Design a protein around this motif. Structure first.
Motif, PDB file in Angstrom:
ATOM      1  N   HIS A  46       0.818  -1.206   0.000  1.00 62.42           N
ATOM      2  CA  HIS A  46       0.000   0.000   0.000  1.00 62.42           C
ATOM      3  C   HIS A  46       0.856   1.262   0.000  1.00 62.42           C
ATOM      4  O   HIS A  46       0.427   2.307   0.500  1.00 62.42           O
ATOM      5  CB  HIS A  46      -0.965   0.008   1.187  1.00 62.42           C
ATOM      6  CG  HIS A  46      -0.286  -0.050   2.524  1.00 62.42           C
ATOM      7  ND1 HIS A  46      -0.517  -1.061   3.433  1.00 62.42           N
ATOM      8  CD2 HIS A  46       0.620   0.775   3.101  1.00 62.42           C
ATOM      9  CE1 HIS A  46       0.219  -0.859   4.511  1.00 62.42           C
ATOM     10  NE2 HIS A  46       0.916   0.251   4.336  1.00 62.42           N
ATOM     11  N   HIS A  78      -3.268   3.487  10.359  1.00 62.29           N
ATOM     12  CA  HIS A  78      -2.024   4.197  10.619  1.00 62.29           C
ATOM     13  C   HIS A  78      -2.179   5.405  11.533  1.00 62.29           C
ATOM     14  O   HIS A  78      -1.192   5.827  12.146  1.00 62.29           O
ATOM     15  CB  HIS A  78      -1.410   4.672   9.297  1.00 62.29           C
ATOM     16  CG  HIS A  78      -0.803   3.576   8.479  1.00 62.29           C
ATOM     17  ND1 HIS A  78      -1.499   2.912   7.491  1.00 62.29           N
ATOM     18  CD2 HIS A  78       0.438   3.033   8.496  1.00 62.29           C
ATOM     19  CE1 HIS A  78      -0.714   2.007   6.935  1.00 62.29           C
ATOM     20  NE2 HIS A  78       0.465   2.056   7.528  1.00 62.29           N
ATOM     21  N   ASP A 186       2.671  -3.652   3.784  1.00 60.78           N
ATOM     22  CA  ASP A 186       4.059  -3.572   3.363  1.00 60.78           C
ATOM     23  C   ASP A 186       4.893  -4.451   4.288  1.00 60.78           C
ATOM     24  O   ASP A 186       4.434  -4.883   5.348  1.00 60.78           O
ATOM     25  CB  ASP A 186       4.549  -2.116   3.385  1.00 60.78           C
ATOM     26  CG  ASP A 186       3.824  -1.251   2.372  1.00 60.78           C
ATOM     27  OD1 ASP A 186       3.194  -1.824   1.464  1.00 60.78           O
ATOM     28  OD2 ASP A 186       3.866  -0.007   2.482  1.00 60.78           O
ATOM     29  N   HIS A 189      10.212  -2.351   7.292  1.00 58.71           N
ATOM     30  CA  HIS A 189      10.658  -0.958   7.312  1.00 58.71           C
ATOM     31  C   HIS A 189      11.967  -0.935   8.096  1.00 58.71           C
ATOM     32  O   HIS A 189      11.961  -1.003   9.328  1.00 58.71           O
ATOM     33  CB  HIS A 189       9.624  -0.038   7.961  1.00 58.71           C
ATOM     34  CG  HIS A 189       8.290  -0.033   7.279  1.00 58.71           C
ATOM     35  ND1 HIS A 189       7.519  -1.168   7.142  1.00 58.71           N
ATOM     36  CD2 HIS A 189       7.586   0.971   6.701  1.00 58.71           C
ATOM     37  CE1 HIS A 189       6.399  -0.864   6.508  1.00 58.71           C
ATOM     38  NE2 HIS A 189       6.414   0.429   6.230  1.00 58.71           N
ATOM     39  N   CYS A 241       3.776  -3.818   8.364  1.00 58.89           N
ATOM     40  CA  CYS A 241       2.685  -2.843   8.599  1.00 58.89           C
ATOM     41  C   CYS A 241       1.303  -3.500   8.787  1.00 58.89           C
ATOM     42  O   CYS A 241       0.613  -3.130   9.734  1.00 58.89           O
ATOM     43  CB  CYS A 241       2.672  -1.866   7.425  1.00 58.89           C
ATOM     44  SG  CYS A 241       1.236  -0.805   7.585  1.00 58.89           S
TER      45      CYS A 241
HETATM   46 FE   LIG Z   1       2.543   1.177   6.501  1.00 53.51          FE
END
Ligand SMILES: [Fe+2]
Ligand SMILES: N[C@@H](CCC(=O)N[C@@H](CS)C(=O)NCC(=O)O)C(=O)O
Length: 294
Positions: A46, A78, A186, A189, A241
């Motif tokens: 995304h 989020h 996702d 990170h 995420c």
């Molecule tokens: Fe994210």
């Protein structure tokens, strides 16, 4: 009341011009050969399309538009504190291609379960994790644009028990061949900006360590095992995420296995926004995959 959720991230996360966006999506999809039709679920990133659109095409090419009629989109929250899942208060999700209608019958059933809260319009429009699947869904379904609906679901910071409860809830829909579950996430990170610097030096360069960590998680998902996925998260705390939507999907899959259904999940593409080589670097990982049910 407001009937339409505006495409609040058009122009900044993806092209705002309908025709140009349609062409971009068509190019990305034309690079992909379908191997997992007709997908009963997909995992897709995304991020902005410049970063992840060619990756996401590997998931969306596996959708068979002559079979799929109802598309659930489970995206992580989020911006808001949310301990359950939330349903939209509008009736239409706008996209630059064409506008998408929410399935009123399913929304009513889901609401009647009593397990969902109602997300305000501002919360709805502020979030991007569902929106980034609207253009791709619209593009994949265009040959049947007048005959399908969507079921947007905002997924909060679910406990393990809530992941199990929502998985059981959604399994009855996952077993229906006209339904498709889009699970938005996702992957790693990596970087100090994400306060995440796990590094396995047996793998070599940092980007190879990231690829290995992500693919351990991806393989666990391919094992259809929510408990092992949870243990993996507890062990490495990989910055996935949409780990809560993924946990929901895995528990739904285990419910269908306990009911005689045979299933298989395959990741079909993996990408990184950049290749981290030093400790000051940062990157985000994207993975596209598809679940088929026989
Ligand atoms: Fe994210
Ligand atoms: N243009 C949008 C999206 C930018 C974007 O896609 N950034 C990448 C990082 S290179 C990404 O993966 N974002 C989503 C994420 O971090 O999970 C913005 O300014 O936030």
């Amino acid at each position: 009341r407001v009937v339409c959720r505006e495409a609040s991230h058009a122009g900044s996360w993806y092209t705002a011009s309908g025709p140009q966006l349609n062409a971009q999506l068509e190019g990305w999809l034309s690079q992909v050969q379908s191997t997992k039709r007709p997908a009963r679920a997909i995992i897709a990133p995304h991020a902005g399309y410049t970063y992840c659109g060619s990756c996401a095409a590997h998931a969306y090419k596996q959708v068979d538009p002559s079979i799929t009629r109802r598309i659930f989109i489970l995206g992580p929250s989020h911006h808001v504190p949310l301990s359950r899942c939330a349903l939209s208060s509008v009736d239409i999700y706008r996209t630059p291609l064409y506008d998408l209608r929410i399935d009123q019958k399913i929304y009513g059933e889901l609401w009647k379960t009593g397990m969902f809260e109602r997300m305000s319009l501002q919360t709805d429009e502020d979030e991007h994790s569902i929106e980034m699947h609207l253009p791709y869904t619209a593009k994949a379904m265009e040959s049947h644009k007048d005959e399908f609906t969507i079921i947007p679901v905002l997924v909060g910071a679910l406990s393990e028990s809530k992941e199990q409860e929502f998985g059981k809830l959604f399994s009855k829909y996952l077993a229906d061949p006209s339904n498709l579950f889009v699970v938005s996430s996702d992957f790693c990170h990596w970087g100090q900006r994400f306060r995440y610097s796990y590094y396995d030096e047996s793998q070599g360069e940092i980007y190879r360590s990231i690829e290995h960590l992500d693919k351990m998680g991806m393989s666990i998902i391919e094992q259809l095992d929510p408990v092992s996925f949870s243990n993996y998260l507890k062990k490495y705390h990989n910055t996935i995420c949409g780990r809560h939507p993924i946990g929901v999907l895995l528990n739904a899959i285990t419910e269908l296995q306990k009911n005689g259904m045979n299933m298989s999940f395959s990741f079909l593409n993996y990408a990184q926004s950049s290749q981290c080589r030093n400790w000051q670097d940062s990157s985000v990982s994207y993975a596209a995959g598809a679940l088929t049910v026989h």
